[PDB]
Amino acid sequence: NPCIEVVPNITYQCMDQKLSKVPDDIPSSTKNIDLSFNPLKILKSYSFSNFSELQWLDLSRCEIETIEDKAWHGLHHLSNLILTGNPIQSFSPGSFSGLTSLENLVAVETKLASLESFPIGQLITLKKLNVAHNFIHSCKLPAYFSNLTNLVHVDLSYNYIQTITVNDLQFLRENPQVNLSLDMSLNPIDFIQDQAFQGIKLHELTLRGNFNSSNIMKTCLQNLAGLHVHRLILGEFKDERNLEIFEPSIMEGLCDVTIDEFRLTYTNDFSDDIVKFHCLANVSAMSLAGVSIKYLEDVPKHFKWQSLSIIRCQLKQFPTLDLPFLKSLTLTMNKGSISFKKVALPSLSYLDLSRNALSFSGCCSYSDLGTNSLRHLDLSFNGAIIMSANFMGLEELQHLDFQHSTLKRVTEFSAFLSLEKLLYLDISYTNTKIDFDGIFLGLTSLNTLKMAGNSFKDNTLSNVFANTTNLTFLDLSKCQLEQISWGVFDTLHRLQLLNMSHNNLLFLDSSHYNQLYSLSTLDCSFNRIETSKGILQHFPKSLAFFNLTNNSVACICEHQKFLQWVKEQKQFLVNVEQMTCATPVEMNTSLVLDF
């Protein structure tokens, strides 16, 4: 093997060795080869006959200039064939013969010249086809597409497509049943013949980076009349030529299209009135991503937006919204630091304001977001939440998440008191000195706590888990505990994962954990335990995992019973192998006294 092997007997990465043919010493029954950047210069017949198990073949950057007739002869299960970079200018007929299950042909930058001089009419399983960067001059879909039943995507980006005509898209007019998804980014389009799109039904249509004259864009977009697209994606790119003036007059012509999901990506110049255009009112799911918006002041009330996403977009103020049909608002990763403000969304059912510096001073009131149907709140990674109410109107919330947001006044009263049906709480890494035994009161249906960077008073785990019976997952890592009080865990009958690593415990006890009937994992690594007092026959007979690593479990005959139990019931412990002792002599595993 002049080439590397990743996995024994499979996955033979043979990239970048001076090769001129497939190595013959490659074992059969492989599933993945990679012959990339090898200086092959011609494929030869039957070369892959032996590899009748290959389902992923890559030939990138090889200098392949021609192809013999029975080149891919013995290939029967090849799903993916990549041919990027090879200057195969002419695909003479008969190519791609032996392949009977090819689902993904990639032919990027192979000096192709037209979609008709492409003998793929027989590949009746081709899901995707990628011919980007390939000198093509016309969008004309050839007729043989009628054979390719399971074709759902075509990529023509970065070609020389110049104009669109009515005889193109004819295959789409005769067949109203194809689910095709086009893509024509970075093509210098300037002329769309009238009535071109008519009775057409695409599932996606990207047009990023095409036009550079507000006039030409206006006219071309106007000629899109009759189109019926399920997702229209517009915008520009940062490293390209682009419009220097953008006005809602451009969006004229879109007023008779039948958009279902209008996506608008980065735009160089952006005026806030664009989204206030009278012929977006029937769009079902608005979305912005990277636009330099400043104020989303007021949109009309006859808009039928059922969704709205604002990701990576600048903002100088929390938007003002009163849409009566909108649900599932999302404002993530905002570039600025904003403060929350009241909204009125009677049909909201999903909120997500993560990763912003949303400093949300007032808190948990129905008066804040007017919705009696919230089900997913997410305020993680924000600036500083200040609790001043018990979520008095939001009694349907099922998913709550603070993860790196400074959470204040949570201990001063029994917050979370009205959330009678909540399943996933998360307050990790919110610096929260638990010094009140009623903080988790009312959460009768919780299933998952997650607190990591939260201290306690006395560095002692108080009794804060009463009336929390259904808890199944619990996490207490990284708290700086130094002991566990007596009486905790006396009712957590269904807990199954107890996490306590990275603490500062000193010993361990078994009087606890005696009621944890269904427990299955008791990770206690890194927490400096020396022994295990109490009767050791009271652990549950369901434990499967015991992390006792990086401790200083001492083996100077200290609790000989424990030093025997640790090497006896070790089919459960984790990495019993490297169990060092910490009292001279160290480097040991067993103690002399047996039984």
């Binding site: 009131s365 001043s388 109410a389 018990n390 008095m392 201990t411 001063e412 009263f413 029994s414 008191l417 009205s418 010094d435 009140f436 035994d437 009623g438 009161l441």
Partner: protein
């Protein structure tokens, strides 16, 4: 025993402390509902101090679970919002203060608050009161 009122959902009762018995009259209008109230509180007494730096220490217990200790500043000397922050020891104070609270949920049970007033400049206790709320 000192005073009590019955509201729709609350029973409020106060008595004197045990280590300080300095007279003070205090009441409210109307009797506080723990379901949110808006009204006045009437105070009548003779300062055992200067009232210029007045604050409180509240030791609260909700169903026998001690909360932490709260400290509320009422006067601080520099242009306070209240006319009685100007009184002197021996000068009768008789006033009425407005208040309003709504939007918090309180559990059912039995609360207790030991409320002790301190003159912040010389740190002596003006009075101590023993409260009792029963929420039903």
């Amino acid at each position: 025993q000192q005073w009590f009122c019955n509201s729709s959902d609350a029973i409020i009762s106060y008595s004197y402390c045990d280590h300080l018995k300095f007279p003070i009259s205090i009441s409210s209008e109307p009797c506080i509902r723990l379901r949110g109230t808006n009204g006045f509180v009437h105070v009548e007494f003779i300062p055992r101090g200067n009232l210029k730096y007045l604050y409180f220490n509240l030791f609260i217990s909700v169903n026998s679970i001690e909360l932490p200790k709260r400290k509320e500043v009422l006067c601080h000397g520099h242009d306070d919002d209240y006319s009685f922050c100007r009184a002197l020891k021996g000068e009768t104070v008789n006033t009425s203060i407005p208040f309003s609270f709504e939007g918090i949920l309180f559990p059912k049970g039995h609360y207790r608050c030991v409320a002790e007033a301190i003159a912040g400049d010389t740190e002596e206790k003006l009075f101590c009161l023993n409260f009792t709320i029963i929420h039903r």
